Amino acid sequence: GDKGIYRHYMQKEIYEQPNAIKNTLTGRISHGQVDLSELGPNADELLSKVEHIQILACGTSYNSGMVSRYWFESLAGIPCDVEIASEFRYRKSAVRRNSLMITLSQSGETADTLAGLRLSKELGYLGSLAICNVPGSSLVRESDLALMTNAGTEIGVASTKAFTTQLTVLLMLVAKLSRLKGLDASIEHDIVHGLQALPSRIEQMLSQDKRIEALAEDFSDKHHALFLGRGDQYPIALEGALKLKEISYIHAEAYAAGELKHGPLALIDADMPVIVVAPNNELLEKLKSNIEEVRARGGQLYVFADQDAGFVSSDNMHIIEMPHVEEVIAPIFYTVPLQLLAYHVALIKGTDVDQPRNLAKSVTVE
Amino acid sequence: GDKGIYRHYMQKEIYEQPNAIKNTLTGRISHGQVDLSELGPNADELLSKVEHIQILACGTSYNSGMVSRYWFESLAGIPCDVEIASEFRYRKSAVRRNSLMITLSQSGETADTLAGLRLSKELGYLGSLAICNVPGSSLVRESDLALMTNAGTEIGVASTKAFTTQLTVLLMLVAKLSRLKGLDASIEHDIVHGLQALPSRIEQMLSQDKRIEALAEDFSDKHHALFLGRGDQYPIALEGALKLKEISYIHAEAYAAGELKHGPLALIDADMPVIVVAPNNELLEKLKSNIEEVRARGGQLYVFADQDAGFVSSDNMHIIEMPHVEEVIAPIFYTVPLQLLAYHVALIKGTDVDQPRNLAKSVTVE
Ligand SMILES: N[C@@H]1[C@@H](O)[C@H](O)[C@@H](COP(=O)(O)O)O[C@@H]1O
Ligand SMILES: N[C@@H]1[C@@H](O)[C@H](O)[C@@H](COP(=O)(O)O)O[C@@H]1O
Ligand code: NA
Ligand code: NA
């Protein structure tokens, strides 16, 4: 494909996010409501019968499914389980009643994910839905239903727009299910308004790629990093650490923010910066208290946070202020600074951003 | 307490595992069947109504719950979800129908776990069961039912016998539920036979603390490690990496074995040994193929495996042969070499095994 003004496909793909998200919403928002009529005329009968959602995926696609679990449960009130596809395909699982199988895949060809879908056909699920970026791929062809992300081809080996568009489709599905369950109409309106505003917020943020370049300079010589997030931001911490592993080759590990004290705190020093993704005040107070315990070793927190929270930087706590955004789309929004941080560290180090060592665009063979 | 012949409480506690496990089984095996009559006369009516199990815990107690999920699903055919207690207490969850809430805690006082139990009382669970090592603790007092692990007091800040005894109680519960559900009696017999044989197998293994001392020498100068496991051994990989973080301060990270290619492979080199916990042949073939991709960087696999698998060491794949054991108790069995590996690295480095920097026996205050 053509990179145009971008140095790398992955860079182009990060900057395409606003347009990719706009494109994923196209035709699916009708009169302020999510319109998934592309699924056909029996889609709602199937979807209304759903009492549990099972999501299978690998790599970055597992991280978007993990965010969505918080949304399906807290917003649509539907039990949701998300699992690495290789874990699912090799174990004897207990299928839940009226369970919908959802696969997430940029390529639609990942061997483990495809194996999970094929296996599920014999396990008693209500049916399957493929959320994918490649039309006519195996996962799309073999699922009962498919919702394409419409992000355009993604050439970077590491997924960027495929992830945020997966999150966009997932959030539309949460909205549609909250309505099929006859839940408060505000749930869907909040989602629609958050989604429609998203492209322009990301565009805004993409223009402030300077505080990110500076943090990148701080991380470019580090060999370890700890990414922390709570709730729907924990999977964003997962994706941020995965991105730093993928293209900068730094040993970045994500962890639930509430578990820092249960192990990882013993590792922290000046060579292992701790990144916190969008904490509320109560959480940041606990984390600051934890970082104070490792002050003697130079432990530092780097916090991406809503400017409205009023956090103030200190010598070992650096607030990277972000514009206030709608809570419903916050996980999508906070992904972007972490993609850019990895990209900038990779640029500084001169690593192969588009084809990182030992990784593949899709693992299609066992 | 008294260490006797041991240098450290944690060392004593690792070596107490056979006796601790024997003690946890005491009074609960009657005529080849699990006897949980200590729960009272209404216990089985409650337990028979269970259609879903929710487990909450933190730290090492989350890892034992994670192993048990595989057992509840594959053996008792009961849907099981396990979550970090801080994640549970801060999110609006979708409670499943006829769900049993189980908390795992050595101390019975962890603030997040206790918060999760208290919150659950208002969320519609069928009831609660506390699996704990400290009698009369808050979690025990506030739960409907309690099964004590009976491991004796655990003084080491890092949990060892509390973890394997939690696994022992969990496996007895899996057996009891398979019987209440009228499943094949062999499930329970397998579990009982595996459990009754466990103390003596661990004792056997504890006598071969020499191949472990040698591997410890190989890891003592490393600053990174990747622990891999599939299925019921993935949580054992989690516990092994947690132990290395806890008492050796090495940046050890666990990962599902099927996800190595999806990111972490790019990090591997001579300074990041990869440990594989009890793989079958098909999995080891894939992992050997992955390690071959990083041969130029000196990537090496260290594999704890059943001698019966017939694996043979090569220059970049070191088989640490273990006696064949009953599959049902394999996760418990393979924990021991990983506890000893961390303990031996800690001994070499001279770190504070019993009171590792920045960690606490229990986080009882918010
Ligand atoms: N490098 C890619 C990742 O970016 C991707 O997340 C994963 C899953 O692929 P897919 O989403 O196509 O299923 O595969 C590879 O590891
Ligand atoms: N150092 C301990 C760990 O060993 C333990 O796993 C965790 C949970 O404590 P508990 O099992 O008592 O709930 O707390 C602390 O972090
Ligand atoms: Na939240
Ligand atoms: Na298994």
Swiss-Prot record, chains A, B:
Q: What is a single molecular function from GO for this protein? A: carbohydrate derivative binding
- Judged by the first EC level, this protein's enzyme class is transferase
Q: Give the positions the UniProt entry annotates as the active site.
A: 361 (for fru-6p isomerization activity)
GO BP annotation list: carbohydrate metabolic process; fructose 6-phosphate metabolic process; protein N-linked glycosylation; UDP-N-acetylglucosamine biosynthetic process; UDP-N-acetylglucosamine metabolic process
Keyword tags: Aminotransferase, Cytoplasm, Glutamine amidotransferase, Repeat, Transferase
Q: Which GO terms describe its cellular component?
A: cytosol
The cellular location(s) given in this protein's UniProt record come to: Cytoplasm
**Protein's job:** Catalyzes the first step in hexosamine metabolism, converting fructose-6P into glucosamine-6P using glutamine as a nitrogen source.
> What name is this protein filed under?
Glutamine--fructose-6-phosphate aminotransferase [isomerizing]
Gene designation per UniProt = glmS
Shown segment, full-protein numbering: 244 to 609 of 609
